Design a binder for this molecule. Sequence first.
Ligand SMILES: Cc1cc2nc3c(=O)[nH]c(=O)nc-3n(C[C@H](O)[C@H](O)[C@H](O)COP(=O)(O)OP(=O)(O)OC[C@H]3O[C@@H](n4cnc5c(N)ncnc54)[C@H](O)[C@@H]3O)c2cc1C
Ligand SMILES: O=C1c2ccccc2-c2cc(N3CCC4(CC3)OCCO4)nc3cccc1c23
Length: 256
Amino acid sequence: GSEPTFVVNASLLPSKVLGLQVQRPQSFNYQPGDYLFIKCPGISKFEWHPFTISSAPEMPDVLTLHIRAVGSWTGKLYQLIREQREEWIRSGSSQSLPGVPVYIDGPYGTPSTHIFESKYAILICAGIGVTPFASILKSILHRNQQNPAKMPLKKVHFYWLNREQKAFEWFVELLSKIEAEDTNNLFDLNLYLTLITGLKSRTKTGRPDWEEIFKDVAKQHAPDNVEVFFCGPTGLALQLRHLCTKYGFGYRKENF
Ligand SMILES: Cc1cc2nc3c(=O)[nH]c(=O)nc-3n(C[C@H](O)[C@H](O)[C@H](O)COP(=O)(O)OP(=O)(O)OC[C@H]3O[C@@H](n4cnc5c(N)ncnc54)[C@H](O)[C@@H]3O)c2cc1C
Ligand SMILES: O=C1c2ccccc2-c2cc(N3CCC4(CC3)OCCO4)nc3cccc1c23
């Protein structure tokens, strides 16, 4: 529930995305995949919008939100931060940067968190739909550095689709640190534009062949259970749903 706090820093990222840092209340506990609702009196004192927490709960003093300017309230928040930041680089640090006051209500849970309790997982996301998976991947890293035993998760298949290639930069560092530190090959990273990421990962092109991919994973893990988690558009969800029934994978209806 409800608690006053501050956007203390922000990040202006490609495809009109704000990388908000928010002072984490001293009593605020979340799980990776959790989201919250946020109110910004400066934009509207009546409106609450939900955003996935892109930070891992192991990061101790701030929450992260990655928000795309897509309409009225996000457009305005973007403009307010662009202008607050351009004005403080023209004026300068006359005094410490003033932090945008906000209300947060949460955390709210999503079935994505069940990944920490699966053996074999498929994560599929498009554009800003990466954000819950961003939180989950960072958490998995803190969790090997501290207790690889307590992890029943044996393989993670990651598919991230984007129409613009500069959107992969939102999380290119995280993807490096995994590429670097995944000596035991827990992860299978796949980036599609719908090698090129300057990653050891070959950025692929076109709509992926989801039948071919689901078949492949089935053969890797059968007869054990694979879980699918999807954050993206419904047309895709619908194709993925049929495919989960075909190859016997777990599906959650989160797309309507
Ligand atoms: C659990 C959850 C997590 C989320 N996490 C994130 C996240 O991490 N990052 C993120 O960026 N977003 C996230 N979202 C989306 C976010 O919550 C915002 O409310 C929404 O993305 C933007 O609100 P807005 O006022 O800016 O846009 P709106 O003005 O509501 O417009 C939104 C969309 O509707 C279109 N539109 C506008 N008017 C009409 C109309 N009359 N008819 C049809 N279409 C119209 C716009 O072009 C745009 O595509 C999440 C949502 C949920 C439910
Ligand atoms: O978990 C969700 C979610 C769950 C149930 C219903 C909707 C969402 C969800 C929607 C969403 N949108 C809709 C697609 C978008 C970006 C913002 O780009 C085109 C217009 O707005 N963006 C999201 C980004 C991250 C996570 C989610 C979402």
